[PDB]
Design a protein around this ligand. Sequence first.
Ligand SMILES: Nc1ncnc2c1ncn2[C@@H]1O[C@H](COP(=O)(O)O)[C@@H](O)[C@H]1O
Ligand SMILES: [Mg+2]
Ligand SMILES: [Mg+2]
Ligand SMILES: [Mg+2]
Ligand SMILES: [Mg+2]
Ligand SMILES: [Mg+2]
Ligand code: NA
Length: 359
Amino acid sequence: SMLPSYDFFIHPMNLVELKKDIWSDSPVPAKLTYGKKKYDIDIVYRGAHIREFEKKSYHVMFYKPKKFQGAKEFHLNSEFMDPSLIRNKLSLDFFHDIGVLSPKSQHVFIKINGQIQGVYLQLESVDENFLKNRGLPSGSIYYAIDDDANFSLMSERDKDVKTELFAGYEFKYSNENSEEQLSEFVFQANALSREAYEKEIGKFLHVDKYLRWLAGVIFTQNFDGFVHNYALYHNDETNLFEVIPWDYDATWGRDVQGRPLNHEYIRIQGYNTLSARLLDIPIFRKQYRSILEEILAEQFTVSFMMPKVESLCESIRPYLLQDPYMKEKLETFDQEADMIEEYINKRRKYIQDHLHELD
Ligand SMILES: Nc1ncnc2c1ncn2[C@@H]1O[C@H](COP(=O)(O)O)[C@@H](O)[C@H]1O
Ligand SMILES: [Mg+2]
Ligand SMILES: [Mg+2]
Ligand SMILES: [Mg+2]
Ligand SMILES: [Mg+2]
Ligand SMILES: [Mg+2]
Ligand code: NA
């Protein structure tokens, strides 16, 4: 399980510019060498608080050649907040396994200007190539970027109806209809009555995929996954929206501050207005309960998940010993598998103990 080794060159003049204001989103030119092939790229720091680490995270945009392994860009996360370096990949792959569209990812080993930077998670860009590589129809992709991506009519800050129902999203891949399609979905999700919901919500939303995404938030326990940490995809063939996870490191027993969970938990009904409206419909409540039971029987088990944990950790461990930011804390890293295993057992019990609430 060798990791891909990427060698980046950033000209010293461009590196000075990159380091001058770490908060800038203006990229600089760079080069990537992978094996015997060289790529002209543009590179920029990514994220927010993750820019504060010496092990920076990067957004890589391919310039010439235009594509690398089917993509025009990817994200390189240090995952430094996660002592295991595996929670984000573990989560996103889990969403895929329970039937939700999800970014692919892989661990890589990077150098910049001949200096090892260590183990990174390469994350797929959810864009037009994400769709094309899965054989999915053209459409629109929107990234949840602020508190208005809440599936409600209401702006929390304004304490009023949103000025625009498409507020809260970056239009990553879009067309002339993208704004009105998103506004219509948000509107109908909130404006359809309980008596009309079962018949009509499925004209705008892929309900089974939404409920499977919701289950995924509940199983991984991303406490901020209901109104953040996702993208929307509007499939132009079916005219339906579905939800795609993003940024799932605060999962499997640790919170966004990196702390172990004590007695904190997420109720099985999850959060946000759309979740609430759906779970007021008997057929959708039963559908969701059946999704949870199915996942408890197949995917969210120690026997299924822990071999993946163990395989990921074994693949990266020798490289962590060569990582100047990680070389020291292999022992904490080694203890994360047991923490994740204990989490699975505790979370399974909670969910099983509360399934009756969906009856
Ligand atoms: N699939 C995605 N969903 C949501 N945001 C994304 C996605 N891919 C990249 N981003 C970017 O992620 C940034 C936030 O960083 P992070 O904290 O890593 O989510 C935003 O500026 C988005 O443009
Ligand atoms: Mg991030
Ligand atoms: Mg390009
Ligand atoms: Mg539609
Ligand atoms: Mg985050
Ligand atoms: Mg209710
Ligand atoms: Na973010």
